[PDB]
Amino acid sequence: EDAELLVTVRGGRLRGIRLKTPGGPVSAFLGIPFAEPPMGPRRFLPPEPKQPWSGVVDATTFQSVCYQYVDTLYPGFEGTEMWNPNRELSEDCLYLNVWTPYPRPTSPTPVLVWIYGGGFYSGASSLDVYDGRFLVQAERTVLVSMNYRVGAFGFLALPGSREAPGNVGLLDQRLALQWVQENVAAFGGDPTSVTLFGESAGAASVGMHLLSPPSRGLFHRAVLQSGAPNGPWATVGMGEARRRATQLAHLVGCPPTGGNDTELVACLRTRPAQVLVNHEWHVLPQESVFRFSFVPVVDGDFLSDTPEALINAGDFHGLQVLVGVVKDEGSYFLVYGAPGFSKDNESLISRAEFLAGVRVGVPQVSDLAAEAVVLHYTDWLHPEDPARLREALSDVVGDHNVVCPVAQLAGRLAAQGARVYAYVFEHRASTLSWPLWMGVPHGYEIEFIFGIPLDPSRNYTAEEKIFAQRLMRYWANFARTGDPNEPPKAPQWPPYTAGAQQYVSLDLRPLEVRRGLRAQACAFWNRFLPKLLSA
Amino acid sequence: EDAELLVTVRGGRLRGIRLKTPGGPVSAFLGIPFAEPPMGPRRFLPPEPKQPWSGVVDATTFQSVCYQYVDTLYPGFEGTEMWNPNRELSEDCLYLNVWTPYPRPTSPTPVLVWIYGGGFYSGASSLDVYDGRFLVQAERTVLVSMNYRVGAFGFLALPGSREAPGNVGLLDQRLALQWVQENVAAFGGDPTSVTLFGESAGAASVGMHLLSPPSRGLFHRAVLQSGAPNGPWATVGMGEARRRATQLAHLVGCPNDTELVACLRTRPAQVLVNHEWHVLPQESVFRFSFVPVVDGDFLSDTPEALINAGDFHGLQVLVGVVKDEGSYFLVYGAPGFSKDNESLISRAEFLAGVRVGVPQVSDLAAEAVVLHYTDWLHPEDPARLREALSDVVGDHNVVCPVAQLAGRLAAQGARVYAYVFEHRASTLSWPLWMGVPHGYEIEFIFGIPLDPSRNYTAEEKIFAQRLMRYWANFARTGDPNEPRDPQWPPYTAGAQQYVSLDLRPLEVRRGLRAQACAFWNRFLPKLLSA
């Protein structure tokens, strides 16, 4: 046996695996159970801690992907398949992964903890693009990632009831974070230097742990990539959560609408997991893009108020946070329902298609609100140019769901004590399989942050390898010090503030400082549109 | 004696005067009566035609200015005084003026008819800046200008009442245009080629005659400079007109519509003027107490409604703006503004000024204005805030009403020519930060720089000659352009082309503040309805 691959955590003994990386070996403990399997009677319930075990658990491969809808819009297309499960689906899914240097560090090492995205309906820590080995080998950090329940299994809510209280997927995340505090030192990690980071719903998840006191003592720094807890898609209210839960139950025969909550969830627990998934999308109130059926619910518990309110009302002194977006946040989403869009043509839509897409991309708002959107995103010297319309609907979707929620969070946290750093990621990967008109689409910075270009199996350019190493250094510098800058003759990355609103561009060129995260657009979404909706 | 200065019109004989210009003499007939003096029992009533007279009416000098408030904000300042009355005030003021080439033309000459601005509360045909002598000598037109009642005397309305029906100042204009039809041939003018032109309220007046069938047969082409009938300041509704007339009566000691007007008629004219501004519902700029009322008669609908619903085939119209439509108005009520400093206001002053420049709108509508006119990378920069509030007032009151008029008329059959006037006069007395302010193209259209007595540059004289040529070309043909050699394209709802007018050659550009005017003309109405 190899003593470097054996570790004892509070629950018992573990055996890991040694991983080859271009720069040297790494130890990986993959598929560590951290909760009792949420099966049968435990479906929809908060996670229970894993009961201790005798003997040695083999933590030598990724465990199952949590039950979730699988994308089939472009079968066999790498651009969609890379986000799909690469392990069997199972409700027996609450495992986490730890990567550490080989040999194990001898002084406590800072810990990065990854929370994946996937719209709160999909995702997995086992995906090739979240491989932790390159980060750990390049920056000598400990990396942890966990699986958490998605879809109805993670976020179906009948608020008030003990049988389906909602938000158990976030409680899965919190339980893993408690696992890190109790156990990460056994791998050489420092429980007093834990940086959360995540993308899309993962980033909103990070933000929700910032705004929930019980999670706030489990980490020290945060990174929000292309997502924010105040996104119009990231939370739902109690009533609409109940309506969605109740319509899902109805669509699958429960009860034999509404009634006793206990009886209804009991009937839901008898349905095969895949049956729930097959009806997941049918509970949404209108045709939309960037909307997901089961998301965190604001019920006073995990979130005492809406994320907008807690952000505006919070003292964030002592917090360092790193936030950003990619260059074309909205493009990806348009091919999932906006009329006239396809990955397989230029998607040069008409004015009528643009106006129709406004209602898909900004669903469930008043006609007047839709008109305010058309006013701000129409160029009235070129109201019908197809190219300009394409990029405008992209900007509508990107600004409303990602950029302006990120901007609001960044500016409010900065003005209330937090040290904030902001980026716009502008490199389009040479390997990208989505069409040229989508630009740098949502999610396509991740592979660079994790250093996937260092994988010799893959076909990135040498400059992209240089660039991934640069980004890994920034992220790790932020995790160890709260500050991405290098402890010289390198251009500096200034804090983001509500007034100067400075951020840096991340691409193959050196850091370039710019001002304003779509400030004119985001004044519309963050300052004016809320007033319009209240009157 | 000089026979070229004696003319007989339908009402009797006139003696005019010969005037000098640097290009030669001109014949002028000034102070021709075209209505019975609207005095005593005739105050607030529609004009009656002038009864015939025996003998020779002396038409050698400007007649009295219609009663009106006089600006006292900068006593002795040329920038305000040039707009103040330059003859005594009288309710006996319904005279018009004719300028003709010398000797009088003997074949029909095209006619320009000037309607002065002044917010419908001030103005006069006798102002130095409206002297017709240069246009007539240089471009061989006949030029007519009329006085029309303003303030309460022209536009106080108790809608429904026979005693104060409203719009009588507009009927003053119509009667003058009828006078032109019957009599202008006696001066060499062609009644079949009559071009209306006006500025500010004068342009709104022109547009109202476009939209009222009884006037539409009295002229053939139209020029609207820095004004439009659909301006939020140019019309008032029946109920608010009644409220303002009633509150004026209260403020001057007067109590039934008949009894109320009878008591108003006993008050000295100057007393009415003294309370005029006090009937406005809030502190404001670019708002005026007594303006045309929409009551179904002169205007069967709102000017915005009539514009969208009209077949305008066969109409040529020339409309435009100056570069800084809003600047002048800010010093009459926007917090932090003065002509005597840089007016580098604070964000708090900007926000307060928005409610002054956009009065009587919901808090949400004001917030929408703040969103659109704030640069959110520089939300508190004084210089940008000054320029933005000028843009708010200028866009809301002039540019975007003009843009709507032009786009709708073009899209419904009219040939439209649009300009932006971008030259700041070397003679301008207003501060540099005001730019090219409201009204300061007029002196160039009238050729005032040709006056040797004044201190314009040689290039400015050439420029005035260019502009007189454009305006006169339009009056003769419906098209300002000269035979080809850079050309001035029609304005269309899509291409939205216009030209800049300044010391450089014509430059074609696109869009009359299209981004801002989409807000005021397309979005804000929907917001106000909900």
Ligand SMILES: *[C@@H]1O[C@H](CO[C@@H]2O[C@@H](C)[C@@H](O)[C@@H](O)[C@@H]2O)[C@@H](O[C@@H]2O[C@H](CO)[C@@H](O)[C@H](O)[C@H]2NC(C)=O)[C@H](O)[C@H]1NC(C)=O
């Ligand atoms: C661009 O594509 C969209 C989507 O259509 C798909 O992709 C095309 C490349 C082609 O393979 C189609 O058959 C695919 O279905 C086109 O919009 C579609 O038009 C068809 C009929 O014309 C209609 O039935 C679909 O509902 C449309 N899809 C929408 C509106 O999302 C679009 O016209 C294409 N642009 C072109 C060809 O210029």
Ligand SMILES: *[C@@H]1O[C@H](CO[C@@H]2O[C@@H](C)[C@@H](O)[C@@H](O)[C@@H]2O)[C@@H](O[C@@H]2O[C@H](CO)[C@@H](O)[C@H](O)[C@H]2NC(C)=O)[C@H](O)[C@H]1NC(C)=O
């Ligand atoms: C620019 O001037 C305005 C107007 O003030 C008037 O004109 C000035 C030239 C000076 O003579 C002032 O004293 C005049 O009252 C200034 O705004 C005024 O500020 C005073 C306080 O001193 C206040 O009482 C008035 O109400 C203000 N007037 C208005 C119209 O808001 C403004 O502060 C000056 N800007 C500067 C100096 O930068």
